[PDB]
């Protein structure tokens, strides 16, 4: 059974002021993507870099999450420190993810170059940064996930199986 981490980085959300929404969309999307058995590990944490670092490390090292997805704090604002926390906990970075998500949003919004989202690997766990805007989460997650099940394959992790009607992942033979 696979475990997938969902981390929402927002001060107002973790305080209880506003509802998540963004984290809810990520879980709804994964439920549409996947047909195999999986379990969501979900956390809401404030915009504190050390808190983000520990949350990612717990999910990857203790709770055995093959994929961890974050939403929030990836822009040029002062409190946006999620990309730095991801680089801290990752021994290897996946630059192709960050390039692709910006190239897709650039087709629509010119400010996509302000996005500092990135992705990397902590051991055999894949961590991916998603935008904080709930509207942009579906498009962004849909652009990178076709490559994710084969990535977890190369790291000898669980075999994620997808509903081909909702998303079609790529796997060479």
């Amino acid at each position: 059974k696979a475990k997938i981490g969902i981390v929402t980085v927002s001060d107002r959300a973790s305080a209880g002021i506003t509802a998540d929404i963004s984290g809810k969309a990520i879980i709804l999307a994964l439920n549409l993507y996947l047909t195999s058995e999986w379990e969501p590990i979900y956390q809401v944490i404030p915009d504190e870099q050390k808190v983000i670092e520990r949350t990612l490390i717990k999910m990857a090292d203790i709770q055995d999450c093959c994929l961890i997805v974050t939403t929030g704090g990836t822009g040029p604002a002062k409190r946006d420190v999620t990309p730095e926390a991801t680089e801290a906990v990752c021994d290897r970075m996946m630059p192709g993810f960050g390039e692709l998500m910006r190239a897709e949003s650039l087709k629509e919004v010119p400010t996509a170059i302000l996005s500092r989202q990135t992705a990397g690997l902590r051991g055999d766990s894949l961590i991916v940064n998603l935008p904080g805007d709930p509207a942009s989460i579906s498009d962004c997650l849909l652009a990178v996930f076709p490559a994710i099940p084969y990535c977890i394959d190369l790291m000898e992790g669980p075999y994620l199986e997808c509903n081909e009607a909702m998303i079609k992942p790529f796997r060479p033979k």
């Binding site: 929404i21 809810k24 969309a25 709804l28 999307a29 439920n31 549409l32 993507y33 629509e108 709930p134 509207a135 942009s136 579906s138 498009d139 849909l142 009607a165 909702m166 998303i167």
Partner: protein, 117 residues
């Protein structure tokens, strides 16, 4: 004695995943905003989508959250030039005695520009 609940939400692209997610989010916010416990209070739910959204029926979002026994019907919105693109609109028929001015209507994402309240 029936009261209609109106809902609207937008999507960034015409993909099946994005249509279903947005409709799930919209549907659940219209239910919460009116304190609707069970689906058995709904007589029917009607959906409209704009011309630029064709990749999925919004009815699949209702079955995704357990509305298998709720009657659903979808249709195409009037293609008014210059109107808001990629809008999913909902008209739910609610079996209740709630006064008209106390029914809460939900407009989400870019669809908040549709009503100035």
């Amino acid at each position: 004695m029936v009261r209609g609940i109106r809902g609207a939400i937008t999507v960034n692209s015409d993909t099946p995943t994005s249509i279903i997610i947005a409709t799930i989010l919209l549907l659940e916010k219209m239910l919460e905003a009116n304190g609707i416990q069970s689906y058995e209070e709904l007589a029917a739910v009607i959906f409209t989508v704009t011309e630029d959204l064709t990749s999925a029926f919004p009815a699949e979002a209702a079955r995704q959250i357990g509305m298998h026994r709720v009657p659903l019907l979808s249709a195409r919105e009037v293609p008014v030039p210059g109107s808001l693109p990629r809008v999913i609109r909902v008209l739910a028929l609610w079996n209740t005695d709630t006064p008209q001015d106390r029914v809460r209507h939900v407009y989400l994402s870019e669809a908040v520009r549709l009503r100035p309240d």
